Amino acid sequence: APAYLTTHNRTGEESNAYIAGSIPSLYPTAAYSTNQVYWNLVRLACYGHTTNGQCPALIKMATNTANPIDIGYVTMDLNTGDITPKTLSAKGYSLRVIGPGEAEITKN
C-alpha cells in the first residue's frame, strides 16, 4: 500500500471526492495545488463504504461553489492503492491515474 493518496489539481477550481457518489471527503484538493492524504485517513474516509478492500467515489470540480461539476466515478483498492478507471474525461475536465495512490486533474 502507498503512504499517501497524492492528488495534483492543475485546474483553477477546487476538486473533492464524493464517497459512494454522495458524501464529500474532508480532504479536498485546492486549485493549482498538490495535496497528500496519509493512508490511514483514506481508510477511515472509506469506512462503511468498503467491500473486498474496494471503495468508489464520484470526483467533482468547483466543490467549494454553489454549482459543483460531476467528472465521473472511480474505485480504489485500499491495499494496493490501484485506481481502476485509469482516466476520466467529462464536462471539459480530464483525470489521469499516474500510479498507485496518485493521479492528476487537468482542464479540457
Residue numbers in the entry: 1 to 108
Q: Anything the authors wrote about it?
A:
L. pneumophila also expresses a type II secretion system (T2SS). In summary, using a combined cellular, structural, biophysical and biochemical approach we have provided a characterization of three novel type II secreted substrates, NttA, NttC and NttE, that are required for infection of several species of amoeba. We also report the X-ray crystal structures of NttE and NttC, the solution nuclear magnetic resonance (NMR) structure of NttA and dynamic analyses for each substrate using complementary biophysical techniques.
We readily obtained crystals of NttC at pH 8.0 and determined its structure using selenium multi-wavelength anomalous dispersion (Se-MAD) and refined electron density maps to 3.1 Å. This is formed primarily by the sidechains of hydrophobic residues and is inaccessible to the solvent. Analysis of the structure using fpocket revealed that the cavity inside the protein has a volume of 782 Å3 and a druggability score of 0.97, which strongly suggests that this pocket may be able to bind one or more organic molecules. Furthermore, when we analyzed all known sequences of NttC homologs and mapped the sequence conservation onto the NttC structure, we observed only minor patches on the NttC surface while many of the residues that form the internal cavity were highly conserved. In our crystal structure, we could not detect any access to the cavity but using MD we were able to observe a breathable core and a transient ∼12 Å diameter solvent accessible channel form over the course of the simulations. Due to the restricted access to this pocket we expect that a large cofactor is inserted during the folding of NttC, prior to its secretion from the periplasm.
